[PDB]
């Protein structure tokens, strides 16, 4: 039968998205250098409150997750409200789910206003690659444990005996799966060898997204939700995304050596999201209170979907898995979609997912559904470019797609938005938006 999840409250009011704003992004070692991710938290929300003029006391919950966590701030959510002007009595917290924490926030917060304990929420996050809280070798940390617990002064020197010249070398950061050791590009790479992804089509997508995203910046459509960031030295503000290379050619892409597998890989820096920094803040709250305080929501909410799959082989197939289930819960179809989006983490896994969304045999045994998802039309797919352009600021990637589509489906007829996104740990995120 119909396995549909109505996203309407106890009183029947549907879950509504009223607005949001995006911090512009810059590469690592750029204007966004050495800035704590917590500081981006205050800045993105503080101006958003003022621009919105929504009261800071009416809000009753908010959760920003973040990749590249820092231990100096265990509960970043408390710090922002203690840093920003919102009421100290808000009962906020933080969560973490890979590169789709924005969507992770979307899930657990939309249900928060489903409970009736609250009425409004705030969505967003901040991750920056220019800042890393790196520590020393693990045993060196273990060594320091005993010395604090040591009681005899002469015992310490005996404890200092175990050392080496390479010990003072700190541990460099890592991105490959801890229990797997496969970097995310590697899993995208093996798919290119598994299913067949030429570099020319992967590089063409890098060109198309660059041409599309730069055109959106050239069209200036992403202006009313993109912040004009100021850097505390206050030298000059940032207005446009410098990551996008809108003046580029496919030939320039093809001269890049493959980064991970330098033997026969079909992915390079050209067709891979670079390390970008930024923040985001988006407002979610039920439609009834929006009319109660007299505000029109920037669209609405229809459904949500998330899947856990294998990491050993083909880990970025979450969107391939999650696509039919979301339309099942929405009672809709890929055809019944004005626009479609997916997080262009890699051009290889991009072509892989849409091909698998169109692979009927994929849904026959892996999913067992009645029919495969459908055909993803490239025209509506990532109209404003994709992640191969703006970049991958990790956490905010989910919300940034939320921003463009709701405006874009505002730029068009109401339609029904849809975004899909892969995540670490065999995780995929998918959902159908309304946008009226």
């Amino acid at each position: 039968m119909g396995q549909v999840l109505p996203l309407v409250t106890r009183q029947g009011d549907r879950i509504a998205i009223v607005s949001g704003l995006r911090t512009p992004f810059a590469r690592q070692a750029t204007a966004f250098h050495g800035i704590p991710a917590v500081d981006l938290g205050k800045m993105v929300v503080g101006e958003l409150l003022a621009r919105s003029e929504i009261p800071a006391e009416v809000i009753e919950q908010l959760v920003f997750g973040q990749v590249v966590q820092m231990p100096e701030a265990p509960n970043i959510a408390r710090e922002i409200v203690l840093g920003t002007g919102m009421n100290v009595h808000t009962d906020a917290y933080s969560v973490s789910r890979a590169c789709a924490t924005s969507f992770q926030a979307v899930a657990n917060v939309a249900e928060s206003l489903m409970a009736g304990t609250i009425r409004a929420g705030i969505a967003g996050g901040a991750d920056s690659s220019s800042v890393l809280p790196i520590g020393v070798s693990k045993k060196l940390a273990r060594v320091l444990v005993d010395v604090n617990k040591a009681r005899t002064m002469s015992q310490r020197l005996k404890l200092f005996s175990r050392l080496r010249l390479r010990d003072l070398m700190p541990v460099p950061p890592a991105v490959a799966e801890y229990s797997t050791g496969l970097r995310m590009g590697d899993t995208a790479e093996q798919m290119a060898k598994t299913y067949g992804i030429t570099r020319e089509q992967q590089d063409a997508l890098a060109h198309r997204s660059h041409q599309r995203a730069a055109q959106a910046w050239s069209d200036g459509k992403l202006k009313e939700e993109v912040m004009t960031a100021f850097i505390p030295p206050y030298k000059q503000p940032l207005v446009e995304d410098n990551n996008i290379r809108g003046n580029s050619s496919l030939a320039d892409y093809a001269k890049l050596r493959p980064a991970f597998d330098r033997k026969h890989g079909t992915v390079t820096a050209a067709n891979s999201t670079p390390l970008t920094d930024g923040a985001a803040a988006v407002i979610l709250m039920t439609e009834s209170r929006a009319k109660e305080l007299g505000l029109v929501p920037l669209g609405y909410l229809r459904s949500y979907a998330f899947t856990a799959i294998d990491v050993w082989q083909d880990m970025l197939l979450g969107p391939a898995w999650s696509t039919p289930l979301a339309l099942e819960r929405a009672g809709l179809t890929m055809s019944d979609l004005t626009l479609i989006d997916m997080h262009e983490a890699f051009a290889a896994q991009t072509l892989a997912n849409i091909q698998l969304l169109g692979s009927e045999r994929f849904a026959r045994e892996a999913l067992g559904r009645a029919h495969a998802t459908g055909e993803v039309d490239d025209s509506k797919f990532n109209v404003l470019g994709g992640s191969i352009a703006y970049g991958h600021p990790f956490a905010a990637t989910g919300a940034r797609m939320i921003t463009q589509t709701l405006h874009e489906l505002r730029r068009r007829g109401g339609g029904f938005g849809l975004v899909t996104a892969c995540a670490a740990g065999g995780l995929g995120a998918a959902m159908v938006l309304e946008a009226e």
Partner: protein, 710 residues
Amino acid sequence: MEMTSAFTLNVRLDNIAVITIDVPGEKMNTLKAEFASQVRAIIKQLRENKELRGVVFVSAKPDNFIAGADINMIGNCKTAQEAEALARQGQQLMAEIHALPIQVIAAIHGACLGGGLELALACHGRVCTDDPKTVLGLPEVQLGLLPGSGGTQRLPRLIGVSTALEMILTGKQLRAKQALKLGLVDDVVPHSILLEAAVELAKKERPSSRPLPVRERILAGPLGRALLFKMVGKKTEHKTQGNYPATERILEVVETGLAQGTSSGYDAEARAFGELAMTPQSQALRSIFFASTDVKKDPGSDAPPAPLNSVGILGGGLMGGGIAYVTACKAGIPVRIKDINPQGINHALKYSWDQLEGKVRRRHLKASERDKQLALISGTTDYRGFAHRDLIIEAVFENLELKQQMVAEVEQNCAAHTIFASNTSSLPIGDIAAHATRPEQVIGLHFFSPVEKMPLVEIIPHAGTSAQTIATTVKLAKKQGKTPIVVRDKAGFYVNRILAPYINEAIRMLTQGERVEHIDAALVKFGFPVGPIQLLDEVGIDTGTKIIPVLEAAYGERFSAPANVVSSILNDDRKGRKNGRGFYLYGQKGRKSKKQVDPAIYPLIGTQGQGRISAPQVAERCVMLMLNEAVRCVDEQVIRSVRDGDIGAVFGIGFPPFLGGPFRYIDSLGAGEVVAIMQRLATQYGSRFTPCERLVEMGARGESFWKTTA
């Protein structure tokens, strides 16, 4: 289609030929004579087309690339000519394969052994997948055999001599990762692009223009080949006791190939089949392999299996941990253990921890997966959660009342679908069952000293045991990597019944003033590896002794050991390595060498007399007693089949494989011929060497226990 054979030629758009090996019959890609013929016809049609530039070879089988030579044609050889001819026809084809100028590539996936690497050395380039199933080697020495052609000469200078010799001798298994860094396989490529990754490798301009140099080039030449040869030969005879041929023969055939050129090895290895392939050692090894393979194919029982994914063990200690270890490390099944004292749980979890992390310590594994099987290790002190164990297995003391009480209560504390099994010491399974609510699901397993080395088990159903209970039990050992053998529920059984005369005679002989070292060295020279007393102590003196009163109460006084001498060691704290003192020196202060026995056991024994009995005489007596018991035990059909009986002794006790086994020995030694000299031994010492009536029956009239074909 009876004409297509397996090698199918396929020409793509480009100037390369992709070759698929699709055997129409068995799932393996084995070798027959006709394949060698038609591929010459196939390569003939390839030679006429000058447009091609390379060739790539495909498994065409998810199971294997090419299995190798099929042993049946080796069994079909009659004299030196056929054995030489198969090698010779292998040479000219492999020479013809190697004679082409264009690039030759073979893609390896699945298995590539024996005749598998035959073609691999005939290809300039080769790729094997990173899938962990692929493997390369020459499993030929085990059969008392050697590769058909090329292996002893063209592999050594392509990869080296030290690696080639040990692979031919030791016969280990080679992985794709270690083959790559060794240099045999040029590249390891993903199975997805395995065919396509070889496409451009076929397009590579050089067939072989810059072969890899030698870092170990120091001994390349005649300066150290003999020094290597003399040391490996001296160790070989020291290790092989001289009773295995095709060991020094390997040194000869390689030496003649290396020294005076390629053509010498061609005739030399062709000649090697002339004598080695037709040798009682060779036939014995070929027959036992077929005997070993059949029982693996044999499913033991006939009833359909039942779902089995949870197992309950009632008893820990060391045996509980060990049996759990294989069922966890190899079988990977969820398991629950209950012990009334956590110390057994704590030690057994330690026990498995002990054997584990040594592979990790060998850097062939990492701790990331190590903890994973630690998770399935589940321990408790209660009956709760045992309701969904598919099988329940007893590992507690052999008190029948204790066994009967626990089996009675475990039914109330476990599902009805659960089948009960017990590794009884001497108690019969039917006697153990007794007041059994589900006796048909009550069955008996039998394990041994730590069975990570021992790949055998015993199947002991009692009077009431559903064939499903057997069928489920039998399929366990297969997924446990063990051989299933169904035996009758009788006192002494089969392995233990024939092992007692092996050790009882050893105890009986040594007390008559014979040194252990001389009888031990001759016995291991004869073909029983590791001698009696060292086996006697480390397996457990008492557990070997415990069955003896049961054996004595079963058949007769023959199983009895001399009184007050075997038992005196037991109540002396001299109870083997488990007690830290027994027979052999256990301090091991002699640089961890072959320490001689404790110089205090001899005064404790009467040890009156001298050697007296000849070195082969004890060896022929030791084999006869088990043989006298082997025919005796199978006389009441304690074993389901003769092949099961043969396979049970040679891998469970240690009969010389080159002799084939107990009844391989009988027919080899003129069938009933040994009876008279055996009867003479009965006259020499006593009626303990009385012939079996069936042994008398087959011996007097002239018979072989195996009609079969000879």
